[PDB]
UniProtKB/Swiss-Prot annotation, chains A, B:
Residues that bear Phosphoserine: 5
Superkingdom of origin organism: Eukaryota
Residue ranges the record marks as coiled coil: 2-61
Subunit structure: Forms a complex with MEC1.
Subcellular location: Cytoplasm; Nucleus
Free-text description of this protein's post-translational modifications in UniProt: Phosphorylated by MEC1 in a cell cycle dependent manner and in response to DNA damage.
Other facts: Present with 606 molecules/cell in log phase SD medium.
Function: Forms a complex with the serine/threonine kinase MEC1 which activates checkpoint signaling upon genotoxic stresses. The MEC1-LCD1 complex is recruited by the single-strand-binding protein complex RPA to DNA lesions in order to initiate the DNA repair by homologous recombination, after the MRX-complex and TEL1 are displaced. Required for the recruitment of MEC1 to DNA lesions, the activation of CHK1 and RAD53 kinases and phosphorylation of RAD9 in response to DNA damage. Required for cell growth and meiotic recombination.
Name by which UniProt lists this protein: DNA damage checkpoint protein LCD1
Parent-protein start and end of this portion: 73 to 132 of 747
Amino acid sequence: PGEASMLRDKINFLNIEREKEKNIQAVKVNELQVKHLQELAKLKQELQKLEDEKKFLQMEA
Amino acid sequence: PGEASMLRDKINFLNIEREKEKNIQAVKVNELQVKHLQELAKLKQELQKLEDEKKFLQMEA
C-alpha cells in the first residue's frame, strides 16, 4: 500500500508542476510581446517623423 | 502491487508529456520571433527608403 501512496503524491506534484510551468511560459511570451510592441512603436514613430520631414521638403516648391 | 504499476505508468506518460509540451512552446515562441523579425525588417527597409528620399530632396539646393 505504501509504494502506491508515494506514487499518488508524485502524480499530484507533477499536476501542479505542469500548471506552474505553463505560467512561466506565459510570462516569457508576455515579455517577448511587450518588447516587440515597444520596438515596433519606436520604429513607427521614426517613420512618421521622416514622412512629415519629406512632406515638408516636397512642400518647398 | 497492481495499483503501483498503474501509477508508475502514469508517471512515465507525464514525464514524456512535459517534454512534448516544452517542444510545442518552443515552436510557438519560434513562430512569434520569426513573425517579429519579418515585421521589423519590413519597417527597417521602409525607413531606409525614406532616409534616402529625404537625402535626395535635401540634395536639391
